[PDB]
Ligand binder design. Structure first.
Ligand code: NA
Lengths: 175, 11
């Protein structure tokens, strides 16, 4: 087993409006090796086969999948916007790519600024996002944005945005 | 705006 730099937690949020968000939010399991990650990924439903309104997230061990968390409070997210027609082609490969960027610590020195990632499966269009700790850190947010977009292999004409959680609750940067 | 991370709008 090949150890990861960090221990990660995979969360699932169920769309069931006959239950509270607490009851619909589930911590599936945690892992700190490549082998344990792959074992987990291959025993859970692909993002593309989730029922509408359902979410996955991966956060560093100790960070709650909530913007009100101390590590997310003053942070934000790089948002990837996928249309209906992209789900079969892009959603799973982009979500897998995102998870590998997290566990692989692919953002060099600014990897510590990474809190986690979220995928939203919605009828109107899906979303992936990488969550960072501080939206004030311009070098960190900009470096993460550039590396992430390159790793997804998105062209220039697809402009991705970074929004602070403060603004979302109520684009600071683009690449 | 009910989604993972922003549960205040899920009430
Ligand atoms: Na399987």
């Amino acid at each position: 087993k090949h150890p990861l730099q960090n221990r990660w937690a995979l969360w699932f949020f169920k769309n069931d409006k006959s239950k509270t968000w607490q009851a619909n939010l589930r911590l599936i399991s945690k892992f700190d090796t490549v082998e344990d990650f792959w074992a987990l990924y291959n025993h859970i439903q692909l993002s593309s086969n989730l029922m509408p309104g359902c979410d996955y997230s991966l956060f560093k061990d100790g960070i709650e999948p909530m913007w009100e968390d101390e590590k997310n409070k003053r942070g934000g997210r790089w948002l990837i916007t996928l249309n209906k027609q992209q789900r079969r082609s892009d959603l799973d490969r982009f979500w897998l790519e995102t998870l590998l960027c997290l566990i692989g610590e692919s953002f060099d020195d600014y990897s510590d600024d990474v809190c986690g990632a979220v995928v939203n499966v919605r009828a109107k269009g899906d979303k992936i996002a990488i969550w960072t700790t501080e939206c004030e850190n311009r070098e960190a947010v900009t470096h993460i944005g550039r590396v992430y977009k390159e790793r997804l292999g998105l062209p220039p004409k697809i402009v991705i945005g970074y929004q602070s959680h403060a603004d979302t609750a109520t684009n600071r940067f683009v690449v | 705006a009910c989604e993972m991370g922003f549960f205040q709008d899920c009430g």
